[PDB]
Amino acid sequence: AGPLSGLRVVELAGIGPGPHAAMILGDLGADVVRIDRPSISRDAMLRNRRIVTADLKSDQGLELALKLIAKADVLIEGYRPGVTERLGLGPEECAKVNDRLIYARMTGWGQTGPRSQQAGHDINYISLNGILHAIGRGDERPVPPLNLVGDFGGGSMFLLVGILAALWERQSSGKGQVVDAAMVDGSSVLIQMMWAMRATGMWTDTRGANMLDGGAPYYDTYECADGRYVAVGAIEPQFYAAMLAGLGLDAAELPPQNDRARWPELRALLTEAFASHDRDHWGAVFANSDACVTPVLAFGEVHNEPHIIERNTFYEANGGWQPMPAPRFSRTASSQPRPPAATIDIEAVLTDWDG
Amino acid sequence: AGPLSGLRVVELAGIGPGPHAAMILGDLGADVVRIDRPSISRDAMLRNRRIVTADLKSDQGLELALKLIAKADVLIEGYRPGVTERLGLGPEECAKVNDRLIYARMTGWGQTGPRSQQAGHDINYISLNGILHAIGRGDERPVPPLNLVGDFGGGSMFLLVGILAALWERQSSGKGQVVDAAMVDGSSVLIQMMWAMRATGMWTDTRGANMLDGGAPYYDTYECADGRYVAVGAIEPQFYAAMLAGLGLDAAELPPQNDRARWPELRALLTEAFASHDRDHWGAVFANSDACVTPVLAFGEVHNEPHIIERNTFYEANGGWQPMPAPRFSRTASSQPRPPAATIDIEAVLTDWDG
Numbered sequence: 001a002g003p004l005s006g007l008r009v010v011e012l013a014g015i016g017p018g019p020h021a022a023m024i025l026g027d028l029g030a031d032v033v034r035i036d037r038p039s040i041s042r043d044a045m046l047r048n049r050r051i052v053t054a055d056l057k058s059d060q061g062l063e064l065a066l067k068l069i070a071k072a073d074v075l076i077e078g079y080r081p082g083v084t085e086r087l088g089l090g091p092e093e094c095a096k097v098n099d100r101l102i103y104a105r106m107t108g109w110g111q112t113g114p115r116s117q118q119a120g121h122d123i124n125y126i127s128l129n130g131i132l133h134a135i136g137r138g139d140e141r142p143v144p145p146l147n148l149v150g151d152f153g154g155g156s157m158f159l160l161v162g163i164l165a166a167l168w169e170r171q172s173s174g175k176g177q178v179v180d181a182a183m184v185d186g187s188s189v190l191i192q193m194m195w196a197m198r199a200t201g202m203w204t205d206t207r208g209a210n211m212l213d214g215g216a217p218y219y220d221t222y223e224c225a226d227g228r229y230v231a232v233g234a235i236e237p238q239f240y241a242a243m244l245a246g247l248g249l250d251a252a253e254l255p256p257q258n259d260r261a262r263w264p265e266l267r268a269l270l271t272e273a274f275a276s277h278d279r280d281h282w283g284a285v286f287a288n289s290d291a292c293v294t295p296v297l298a299f300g301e302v303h304n305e306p307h308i309i310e311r312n313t314f315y316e317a318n319g320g321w322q323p324m325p326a327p328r329f330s331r332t333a334s335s336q337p338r339p340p341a342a343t344i345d346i347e348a349v350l351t352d353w354d355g
Numbered sequence: 356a357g358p359l360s361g362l363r364v365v366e367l368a369g370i371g372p373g374p375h376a377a378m379i380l381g382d383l384g385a386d387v388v389r390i391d392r393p394s395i396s397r398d399a400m401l402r403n404r405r406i407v408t409a410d411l412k413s414d415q416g417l418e419l420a421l422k423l424i425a426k427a428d429v430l431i432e433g434y435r436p437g438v439t440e441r442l443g444l445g446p447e448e449c450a451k452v453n454d455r456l457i458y459a460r461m462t463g464w465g466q467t468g469p470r471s472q473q474a475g476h477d478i479n480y481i482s483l484n485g486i487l488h489a490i491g492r493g494d495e496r497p498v499p500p501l502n503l504v505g506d507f508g509g510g511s512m513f514l515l516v517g518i519l520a521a522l523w524e525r526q527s528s529g530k531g532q533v534v535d536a537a538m539v540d541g542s543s544v545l546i547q548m549m550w551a552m553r554a555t556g557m558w559t560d561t562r563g564a565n566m567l568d569g570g571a572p573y574y575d576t577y578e579c580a581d582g583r584y585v586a587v588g589a590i591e592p593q594f595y596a597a598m599l600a601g602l603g604l605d606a607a608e609l610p611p612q613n614d615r616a617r618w619p620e621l622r623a624l625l626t627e628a629f630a631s632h633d634r635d636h637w638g639a640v641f642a643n644s645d646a647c648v649t650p651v652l653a654f655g656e657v658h659n660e661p662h663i664i665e666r667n668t669f670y671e672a673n674g675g676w677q678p679m680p681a682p683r684f685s686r687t688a689s690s691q692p693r694p695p696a697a698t699i700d701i702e703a704v705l706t707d708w709d710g
């Protein structure tokens with residue numbers, strides 16, 4: 001029902017970014033068929049799928065895969081470079097049966113280069129390009145921002161942009177091509193703002209000492225009386241003033257907002273203020289204000305938040321809450337995701353796809 | 356020269372996700388025209404644009420904006436809901452002159468709901484949906500993962516997916532629609548893996564006590580003899596074994612990899628090992644293997660890393676390095692980004708676009 005209704009996607013089962021990209025395509029209405037190896041999933045990622053099984057190293061498995069690919073718009077693979085090539089499913093082999101195919105290759109290091117054959121995970125890819133070094137408090141070793149930056153923000157999301165951009169190009173050229181989405185590249189573009197700021201003296205390599213990394217007292221979390229937290233993001237002077245107004249602090253008795261030499265003094269004063277009441281008290285104080293103060297909610301509490309409820313950001317499906325499709329479309333709205341279903345026959349899909 | 360060559364984009368100047376989305380469209384070949392308020396640029400994010408100025412609150416400014424929009428494929432705006440409406444540039448007004456327009460609305464809270472009129476920044480949007488609570492060490496307050504997750508991973512990247520998906524739909528329907536990209540939604544889909552794992556007992560709400568948040572000794576950073584860091588991401592047993600081999604540790608003398616009760620003991624043993632030599636020594640020892648051990652590089656040293664150099668992940672511009680376009684395309688490759696140029700006349704663009 002979403003904007004991608006009619007789009008045919010073959011997904012070769014991997015981990016991390018590949019399945020996340022395939023999920024989003026499915027969320028938006030695409031017809032996604034996932035090929036897994038021999039031997040109902042409880043993994044909520046893998047919603048909006050039809051799952052088939054094939055031994056891609058056997059003659060029969062390779063034949064059935066190529067027949068499926070011959071009728072597809074997009075192929076997603078997330079193995080080491082050379083893996084699909086040795087299987088007989090490389091770009092050159094797929095082009096022989098389908099030159100309209102968008103061949104989307106999801107890796108961390110890319111298709112070539114000295115590390116291209118090296119195993120890795122999110123934390124490794126963001127280590128090499130300056131990102132991981134920049135995350136965390138200054139007095140401690142870097143902390144991983146989960147796998148949000150390599151696998152997803154700079155990974156699957158760039159694969160998706162590539163797939164959809166190539167599909168636009170195809171409307172005029174009539175032909176597909178290969179998309180090389182490397183997490184080391186995508187995450188670098190994701191953090192382009194910092195590279196831009198570094199060039200103009202607006203960002204430093206010192207961890208925890210910048211405007212957006214926790215270094216600024218007006219852009220950080222604060223612990224409240226109940227041991228829970230608020231987030232403060234009051235960058236602009238008018239928003240910062242509203243924050244001080246709600247705390248009841250006289251600006252004339254405080255250091256200037258952007259006098260960095262007195263930031264520890266400013267932070268201590270704000271720390272004392274926020275610590276004087278519980279988290280939910282500050283929700284009441286800052287209601288309908290531009291102070292940029294919000295409660296820091298744990299996953300388990302999210303479903304009780306009015307703004308979350310009223311916009312249906314989540315749906316409840318056997319097990320727990322799951323995020324609804326994003327972004328949203330006014331005319332061709334995405335459906336509530338279909339849960340994981342039982343594995344079906346590969347020939348049944350071919351009959352449906354006319355292959 | 357990239358896959359989006361020929362696509363016409365009008366960007367109403369904002370901050371954060373909007374300009375980043377417009378940048379990526381420009382990177383991939385789109386014709387992006389940014390309208391700023393009247394009042395050269397040092398900001399590398401404004402690469403691949405033509406800059407014009409108009410007072411959108413004046414009769415003439417509004418008229419010229421609508422003329423430009425009448426000839427565009429995409430409009431990007433990142434103001435509070437209602438702002439474009441008040442200007443006379445709302446979706447209903449734009450539809451009168453161009454029903455093929457993809458109207459892309461970039462916000463934090465979304466178009467409706469109790470928080471939709473409140474000012475905010477990245478930290479606020481990720482505070483409300485469980486993300487911020489999950490980032491950082493367990494014995495301290497949450498730390499912002501810069502503005503990577505709300506503004507970009509869960510913001511601009513979802514705006515881009517929406518824009519390009521809506522363009523795909525337009526080929527068959529003949530018309531555009533409104534894309535509502537809210538950072539609170541996009542970032543929730545970005546972290547879908549955690550929502551999935553929470554439902555199956557594979558993730559907990561306790562900060563710093565899980566597999567991918569720094570809780571696991573095989574998925575974290577370690578400080579070396581020189582005070583610099585390595586990242587370890589050796590999740591799978593064969594990769595973990597390769598890491599132990601490189602360290603010269605006897606597996607029989609260590610606790611099991613996934614015995615969580617003995618994780619502090621395991622971490623202490625690995626800490627002692629990594630502390631015995633400098634970062635670059637471990638960089639050498641693990642340069643080629645599948646151990647998932649990488650040096651943690653600061654921004655300033657990224658340009659000296661062989662894998663970064665040989666793949667041209669970055670280019671030099673205005674005294675500093677900037678990331679090359681991502682992802683990469685085999686047939687319609689993106690060009691090196693054009694630097695920010697001087698503001699040009701709005702009528703010169705209309706002559707070019709025939710409007």
Ligand SMILES: CC(=O)/C(C)=C(/[O-])SCCNC(=O)CCNC(=O)[C@H](O)C(C)(C)COP(=O)(O)OP(=O)(O)OC[C@H]1O[C@@H](n2cnc3c(N)ncnc32)[C@H](O)[C@@H]1OP(=O)(O)O
Nearest residue numbers: 015016036037055056057078079080107108119120121122
């Ligand atoms: C998730 C998470 O926690 C995090 C935090 C992440 O970052 S996730 C991001 C992680 N990084 C990435 O994703 C980056 C890119 N990926 C990689 O670097 C690797 O895939 C990793 C390292 C992930 C696994 O290494 P690996 O050595 O285990 O796998 P491989 O070298 O790719 O070879 C696969 C083999 O399986 C075979 N096969 C497959 N399907 C079928 C089938 N249906 N039928 C039959 N056979 C099949 C292939 O033919 C192939 O066989 P060979 O060619 O060896 O004879």
Ligand SMILES: CC(=O)/C(C)=C(/[O-])SCCNC(=O)CCNC(=O)[C@H](O)C(C)(C)COP(=O)(O)OP(=O)(O)OC[C@H]1O[C@@H](n2cnc3c(N)ncnc32)[C@H](O)[C@@H]1OP(=O)(O)O
Nearest residue numbers: 370371391392410411412433434435462463474475476477
């Ligand atoms: C950046 C960063 O470091 C981080 C970490 C981030 O997260 S970034 C993410 C930040 N979050 C978001 O982006 C989320 C969405 N955005 C927002 O919530 C707000 O835009 C913020 C809060 C960012 C600024 O609040 P605000 O009160 O300053 O702005 P506003 O309420 O939107 O109204 C704009 C006004 O400007 C006028 N104008 C514009 N162009 C022209 C023109 N050419 N000619 C003439 N006039 C023009 C409009 O007509 C309008 O006037 P009114 O209608 O009031 O009379």
